[PDB]
Design a protein around this ligand. Sequence first.
Ligand SMILES: Nc1ncnc2c1ncn2[C@@H]1O[C@H](COP(=O)(O)O)[C@@H](O)[C@H]1O
Ligand SMILES: Nc1ncnc2c1ncn2[C@@H]1O[C@H](COP(=O)(O)O)[C@@H](O)[C@H]1O
Ligand SMILES: [K+]
Ligand SMILES: [K+]
Ligand SMILES: [Mn+2]
Ligand SMILES: [Mn+2]
Ligand SMILES: [Mn+2]
Ligand SMILES: [Mn+2]
Lengths: 270, 270
Amino acid sequence: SPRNCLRFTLLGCGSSPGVPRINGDWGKCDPKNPKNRRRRASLLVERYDAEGNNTVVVIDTGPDFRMQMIDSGVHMLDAAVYTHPHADHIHGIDDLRTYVVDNGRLMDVYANRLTRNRLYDTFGYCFETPVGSSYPPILSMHDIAPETPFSIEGAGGAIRFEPFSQVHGDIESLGFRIGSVVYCTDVSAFPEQSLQYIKDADVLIIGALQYRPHPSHFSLGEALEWIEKLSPKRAILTHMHVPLDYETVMRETPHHVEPGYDGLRFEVAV
Amino acid sequence: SPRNCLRFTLLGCGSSPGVPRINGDWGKCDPKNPKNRRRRASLLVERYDAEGNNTVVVIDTGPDFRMQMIDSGVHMLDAAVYTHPHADHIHGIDDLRTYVVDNGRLMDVYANRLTRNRLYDTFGYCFETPVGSSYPPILSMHDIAPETPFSIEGAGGAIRFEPFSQVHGDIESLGFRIGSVVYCTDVSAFPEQSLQYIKDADVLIIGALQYRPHPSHFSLGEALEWIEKLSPKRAILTHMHVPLDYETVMRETPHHVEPGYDGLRFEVAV
Ligand SMILES: Nc1ncnc2c1ncn2[C@@H]1O[C@H](COP(=O)(O)O)[C@@H](O)[C@H]1O
Ligand SMILES: Nc1ncnc2c1ncn2[C@@H]1O[C@H](COP(=O)(O)O)[C@@H](O)[C@H]1O
Ligand SMILES: [K+]
Ligand SMILES: [K+]
Ligand SMILES: [Mn+2]
Ligand SMILES: [Mn+2]
Ligand SMILES: [Mn+2]
Ligand SMILES: [Mn+2]
């Protein structure tokens, strides 16, 4: 079992409608390769101590969150951290409820002001009981902001996140460095001040939506341009839409670069 | 292939956290029986004509909606109809977007005032582009109300729904009769005026949450009491929580009564 490490699980590596889309559209993906079946983008972050006790933090709770956690085999959760308030990253939020019961404590969630204010609007009942309801709240909100590190405590010891700003079309999203692993989904440009957090990563997990330009995400070409500049030891592509077939993208990319797949899992030193 | 019929698919038959819960809790369900793996409650309703053209209507779009539709093998959708605005019935709403593109038309959705006003609050961007966004709306709203039949048109011909009031703890939910098939989820009591819609069904699909009383749902015993009173030819239990194991409930219930399972599918005459 895992010991003395951080462990990362790519819970989902698809674009907002998943692969295939709800209408059975696989695009250019080989439907016979299980790696092309893609849930919505999310990352599990764990820290294990010397006895195998873990601290568990999820990045984003999209609609696939429940199945992602079940399939991960990890049955406890200390916190959720949010990138930005788009459907595919937040609409599985209600499923945090079970852990609140298990932990005997509100679920700590971490979000910037933009994300937090949208969650309040759309999932107010998770924070405050509305008129005419008996459901207690389930979440405890913590602010995060680019360039301000924060740490989440748990049974495995603390996990320190370094958030930073990303341009995501018409809005801002957050990326995070955790040790020498960096997670950059839903990003169309990196601001100059964010570069320090993204360069020289052991593992850079970076969104590449499709081949053609898109206003809100890097194309594969743009992602690769960034990877050449930032010199990660290994890169893993995420938030991949239906034009991007696993085997195909594997061939089209340098040896140290690969398309992700759901369930992709690795350990690193702490 | 189906012809000259209505076809019903039980897309999901679980309680709000699914079976197992997100933490891997199966309760008393046999984890080795695939029928005990339960997605959130939803019903697919189709009408096929003599050439196999279909009209397709979903009841509720919970978080499992995308996988439910993919697994159903049905790749088009004419409308969504809503029972009530609880997470497990609405939080997969964004995934209607693909069909809007396919159909070239906003997705017609049907909801009562209570449900509609909550959807507006929490998923406003689906109806109206907010400040600072370029995303067009995706939904077109239609009112429904107990005791007022409504029909949805499509390639297979019209599907006529007869909505009626249900008590669901502290709120009201809707049930629906479609021909001689009746769908009653999230119900703790039936008002006297609703009884005409529920009696003498060919197939009564009725929520039974667990063995012990619950303020918002019928227990198994209460569901069975109702079934004895309403004399459906066949009953199928839905919205079943982790205390209710498939094989076990199968034995505990009369011959004409069965626990549902995800993917349960039948055709009836029009
Ligand atoms: N105002 C909004 N709030 C939440 N989700 C949105 C909003 N506008 C669009 N979306 C959804 O957010 C996702 C955008 O996907 P992405 O291409 O991954 O940035 C899609 O699921 C959209 O339908
Ligand atoms: N105000 C609310 N709006 C939407 N969903 C809610 C609200 N309050 C509770 N819920 C969720 O609705 C579901 C209630 O489940 P049920 O037992 O099937 O009626 C659970 O997912 C709750 O977390
Ligand atoms: K490669
Ligand atoms: K039986
Ligand atoms: Mn996204
Ligand atoms: Mn996004
Ligand atoms: Mn429910
Ligand atoms: Mn409910």
